[PDB]
Design a binder for this molecule. Structure first.
Ligand SMILES: *[C@@H]1O[C@H](CO)[C@@H](O[C@@H]2O[C@H](CO)[C@@H](O[C@@H]3O[C@H](CO[C@H]4O[C@H](CO)[C@@H](O)[C@H](O)[C@@H]4O)[C@@H](O)[C@H](O[C@H]4O[C@H](CO)[C@@H](O)[C@H](O)[C@@H]4O)[C@@H]3O)[C@H](O)[C@H]2NC(C)=O)[C@H](O)[C@H]1NC(C)=O
Ligand SMILES: *[C@@H]1O[C@H](CO)[C@@H](O[C@@H]2O[C@H](CO)[C@@H](O)[C@H](O)[C@H]2NC(C)=O)[C@H](O)[C@H]1NC(C)=O
Ligand SMILES: *[C@@H]1O[C@H](CO)[C@@H](O)[C@H](O)[C@H]1NC(C)=O
Ligand SMILES: *[C@@H]1O[C@H](CO)[C@@H](O)[C@H](O)[C@H]1NC(C)=O
Ligand SMILES: *[C@@H]1O[C@H](CO)[C@@H](O)[C@H](O)[C@H]1NC(C)=O
Ligand SMILES: *[C@@H]1O[C@H](CO)[C@@H](O)[C@H](O)[C@H]1NC(C)=O
Lengths: 148, 119, 92
């Protein structure tokens, strides 16, 4: 980052992710964001409130733990393949992808830092999505860490 | 919207008590959002924009670092040092699942010091 | 083959002196105003009947003594976990 700037809110209000159904087994395929979901209980102990444990986030929404928002964090890393652009088709053989990545990571890089030509324009000025792609809105129910 | 937050417990045993939430919980229609996004049917839509961060970013690639640093300090030392750097947070990042391999640090030094490990 | 004691867990009408209208008096939990899952605090229908007005007697219509709510096939399993309050009949 240029300067620290963590997540200000306490609860994520996003309804694009299907909620678990009435049945115990999930009819839909598993969604990652369910790991940060507050479950509604029909039977409750005496004097149970969301302010005591679940913060200010309204029930039925998503609550973000404390360790995912720090004033004092300064650097992020990720060893993932999901940010790659349209030129990383999975059906292609591994050798072709490796060769193309090796060829691309030489023209774009100066020293060891990436030129602004490759990063998305939202992240920094002058981008053209040469290496990374944009972030969609449907890409939130399986990769909460990236959006957060 | 339905009433205020409520707790009702008329039974003598206080271990189990009834809770009436502030808002409705329509768990029967669990596909509302996904079908709503595709604009299959018209309906309410609420979008609000909030700003969190400013200024530009900088990104470094570890693969180019491996290639460049291995030339002047060998291959064992650079790999060992970069593994130590990659396991800063007390948990390995490579072992983590691909869909959830995201984690941050607190003021690390990059590139790290490469020991002069004799072969 | 191994029980030395027999118990019954059923929601059928006519058991434990439970009717279709006494539920409010029977269960304190639903004493409050129902404003809640559809199965919360929720039959008997006529005598056994066979009706066959068609000439062909091979296929004929049958009206059972009791209701057959096959649509709600998860009533007992969800009822056991005490997710929602409702009738309960146990006899030893
Ligand atoms: C083969 O044999 C096994 C072993 O006996 C049977 O399993 C037993 O089944 C019975 C029948 O359901 C079970 O008994 C039930 O226990 C419930 C729990 O009671 C607890 O509640 C208090 C307060 O929470 C606890 O502190 C205390 O430990 C009690 O044990 C009761 O709620 C059930 O009904 C009781 O309450 C109602 C009012 O709500 C009364 O009307 C009833 O008369 C009764 O008093 C019920 O008694 C028992 O737990 C099971 N296990 C064991 C080890 O006995 C199998 O069912 C059987 N197979 C058959 C019959 O097919
Ligand atoms: C990724 O995002 C960038 C901007 O965040 C998109 O660039 C815009 O493209 C549209 C037309 O495609 C132009 O009208 C805008 O002026 C562009 N924004 C700029 C130049 O800042 C880009 O199209 C997106 N790519 C994908 C695949 O979604
Ligand atoms: C964050 O960093 C500050 C720096 O002074 C420190 O006081 C605080 O304990 C740190 N918090 C965590 C959770 O590491
Ligand atoms: C890098 O790519 C650009 C176009 O993307 C091309 O013109 C150029 O020849 C390539 N090589 C170098 C060394 O710039
Ligand atoms: C990663 O670091 C942790 C420190 O918490 C250590 O216990 C573990 O053995 C390390 N894993 C390695 C070096 O592979
Ligand atoms: C209803 O109660 C009476 C007495 O209280 C009892 O004799 C009768 O068996 C009960 N009915 C059933 C179906 O258990």
């Amino acid at each position: 980052y240029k300067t620290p700037q963590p997540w200000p809110n306490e609860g994520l209000i996003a309804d694009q992710c299907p909620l678990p159904g009435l049945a115990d087994v999930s009819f839909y395929p598993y969604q990652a964001i369910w790991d940060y979901y507050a479950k509604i209980e029909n039977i409750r102990p005496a004097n149970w409130t969301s302010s005591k444990l679940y913060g200010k986030a309204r029930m039925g929404s998503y609550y973000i733990p404390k360790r995912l928002r720090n004033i004092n964090n300064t650097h992020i890393l990720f060893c993932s393949d999901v940010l790659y652009s349209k030129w990383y088709n999975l059906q292609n053989s591994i050798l072709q992808n490796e060769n193309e990545l090796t060829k691309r990571l030489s023209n774009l890089t100066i020293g060891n830092k990436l030129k602004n030509r490759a990063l998305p324009y939202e992240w920094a000025k002058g981008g053209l999505n040469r290496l990374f792609r944009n972030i969609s809105v449907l890409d939130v129910c399986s990769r909460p860490e990236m959006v957060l | 919207r339905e009433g205020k937050e409520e707790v009702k417990c008329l039974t003598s045993d206080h271990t189990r008590c009834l809770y009436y939430p502030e808002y409705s919980n329509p768990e029967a229609l669990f596909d509302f959002g996904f079908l709503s996004y595709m604009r299959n049917f018209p309906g309410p839509q609420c979008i609000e924009s909030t700003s969190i961060r400013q200024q530009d970013y900088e990104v470094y690639s570890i693969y180019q670092e491996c290639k460049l640093a291995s030339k002047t300090y060998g291959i064992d030392s650079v790999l060992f040092s970069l593994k130590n750097f990659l396991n800063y947070t007390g948990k390995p990042v490579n072992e983590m699942p691909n869909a959830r391999a995201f984690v941050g640090l607190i003021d690390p030094k990059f590139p790290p010091t490469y020991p002069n490990i004799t072969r | 083959l191994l029980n030395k004691t027999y118990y019954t867990f059923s929601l059928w009408e006519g058991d434990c002196n439970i009717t279709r209208y006494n539920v409010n008096e029977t269960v304190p939990e639903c004493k409050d105003f129902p404003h809640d899952h559809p199965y919360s605090c929720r039959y008997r229908e006529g005598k056994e009947e066979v009706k066959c007005l068609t000439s062909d007697h091979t296929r004929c219509l049958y009206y059972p003594e009791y209701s057959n709510p096959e649509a709600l096939f998860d009533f007992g399993f969800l009822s056991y976990m005490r997710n929602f309050p409702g009738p309960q009949c146990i006899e030893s």
